[PDB]
Structures are given as C-alpha cells and as structure tokens.
Design a protein around this ligand. Structure first.
Ligand SMILES: C[S@+](CC[C@H](N)C(=O)[O-])C[C@H]1O[C@@H](n2cnc3c(N)ncnc32)[C@H](O)[C@@H]1O
Length: 274
C-alpha cells in the first residue's frame, strides 16, 4: 500500500535483463577492478578497500552527513570496509569492529591501510545480544534483504532497536542502515528516535536500485516521511525509464601505515589471529 511496497512488488516481477538494467540505472558505482585483483592475489601492501560498502561511508562522511571521530564502533563490520575507512580518518583514535563471521557470513579481512594498528576486530560476535560499550561514533551496516517484505520490516526494526541499546550519552555521531525504511512501523520508529536523538535519513547514491535501503545519520535533520517517499518515487521513476547506465567513480583508495593517536608485538599477535 506504500509506494515502497509497490516498488518491491514490481522489482520481483522484472525479467533478468530488465532487473539487471534497472538495478544500475543512474546509480553511482566505484570501479572495484583493482581492489578485487589485489584481494585475489592476497596483497596487504596496497591501500585498497576490502569491500564495495566503503564507498557508502566515504560518501556519507565527505558529504557531511556523518562526523567520524574519537572511539568508533562498527556493528556488523563483515570484511571491515567501514572499519578501515574510519581508521584512516584524522580525528579517529580507535576502531572496534564486531561481526558474526559464521557460515556464509563475511569474516574480517586483514589489511594495512592507514590506521590498521588502531583497528581491532572480533568475529563470532552477535551485536544484538553482546554487551555494549561507549562510542563517540556508532556505525551499523546491518539489514539482510528478503523476498518477504515483513521479514525485512522485522529485520529493520531489530537493527534500530539494537542501535538504541548500543547508543551511549557520548554517541553524538551515528550511521545506521535502514533496510526497508517505507514500512509504517519503521517510519514511526525513526520518527521516535529523531524526537530523542535528532538526525535524519538519507539515500546513498551507491545503493543499487534493487534495494530501498537508507541510512539514519547524525549530521543532517530532515523529514523522515518526505525523504523515504522521495526515494520511493525516485526508485519508481527509474523503473519506468531505466537508463541502464551508472556513474562510475574512483574506488576508496587509502594510504597505508600506522597512526599515532606503538606495540608491534601485540599487533603481530592481533594480525596472526585475523
Ligand atoms: C556484509 S555487511 C557489512 C559491510 C561493511 N559495512 C563493509 O563495508 O565491509 C553486514 C554484516 O553484518 C553482519 N551481521 C548481521 N547480523 C549481525 C549480528 N547480529 N551481529 C554481528 N554481525 C551481524 C553480517 O554477517 C554481515 O557481514
């Protein structure tokens, strides 16, 4: 009944060729060719990003939707694309990434982009049930798509609920994936969070048109219903007139090395484990 649900229904009726043409229509895309070859080759001496997701947080950060600073927590870090990005940032002092890393889930990848020494990963960690800890910057990129819209609704709600559990008084900066933002319960939850914590919701152009995912962020205030509806209408318009062409931009390439705000023995042990 929402435009979002209409979008989702139509998406799953498209032919293969049509779905493929649609999913990239007028989106932005980083070229991952170089990073993929270095990952395959298993190099750790090159400043590449371990995932395509790093482009999302770079956009959010550079645009000013998110300040990344102090003690950064990254919930559902997977390979760690957001964790390594954060670690390379001037005002960041530490990064802690948590992820399941169970069968069929990505495990943290060892890399040596700038600030790798201030990043700690722990897999086999369920962020929904584990103890919380303070953060200045709280990131969560969780929300697994499903053909059942109600499963997506429930998954979105759980992510938002867990964000509120992890948020400390000093957590002034945040970025939380909202997988399916158009469900009335999700809109309501977002509005209730905003009443307490401010912020707003944004569509990242690096998201494919095959997902309606948006991000609840600390660095801008906006009207939740309007932004979500605006995105719904944009995904629908692109569906009526698919260009089949994405805007290609350069990938998240980073310098390498360690930061000052160094115990190489404990670092080696940390890398041995990853
Ligand atoms: C792959 S995306 C992370 C992408 C990441 N932002 C990047 O740039 O590399 C979501 C990750 O969250 C993890 N995840 C889902 N539910 C989780 C949970 N309850 N606790 C910890 N991690 C979870 C998934 O295993 C998945 O790897």
């Amino acid at each position: 009944v929402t435009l979002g649900e209409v979008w989702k229904r139509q998406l799953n009726m498209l032919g293969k060729q049509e779905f493929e043409r649609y999913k990239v229509s007028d989106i932005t895309e980083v070229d991952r060719t170089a990073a993929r070859r270095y990952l395959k080759e298993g190099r750790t001496d090159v400043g590449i990003s371990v995932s395509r997701g790093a482009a999302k947080i770079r956009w959010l950060h550079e645009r000013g939707y998110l300040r990344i600073t102090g003690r950064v927590l990254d919930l559902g870090c997977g390979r760690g694309g957001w964790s390594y990005y954060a670690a390379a940032q001037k005002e960041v002092m530490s990064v802690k990434g948590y992820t399941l890393g169970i069968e069929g889930h990505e495990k943290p990848i060892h890399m040596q982009t700038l600030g790798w020494n201030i990043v700690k990963f722990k897999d086999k960690s369920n962020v929904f049930t584990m103890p919380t800890e303070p953060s200045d910057t709280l990131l969560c990129d969780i929300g697994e798509s499903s053909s059942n819209p109600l499963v997506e609704r429930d998954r979105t709600m759980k992510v938002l609920e867990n964000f509120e559990r992890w948020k400390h008084v000093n957590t002034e900066n945040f970025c939380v994936k909202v997988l399916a933002p158009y469900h009335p319960d999700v809109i309501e939850k977002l509005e209730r969070l905003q009443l307490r914590f401010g912020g707003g919701i944004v569509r990242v152009p690096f998201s494919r048109n095959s997902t309606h995912e948006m991000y609840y962020i600390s660095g801008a205030r906006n009207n939740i219903t309007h932004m979500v509806n605006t995105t719904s209408r944009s995904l629908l318009r692109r569906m009526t007139r698919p260009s089949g062409k994405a805007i290609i931009e350069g990938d998240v390439f980073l310098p390498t090395g360690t930061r000052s705000v160094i115990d190489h023995e404990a670092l080696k042990l940390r890398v041995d484990q990853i």
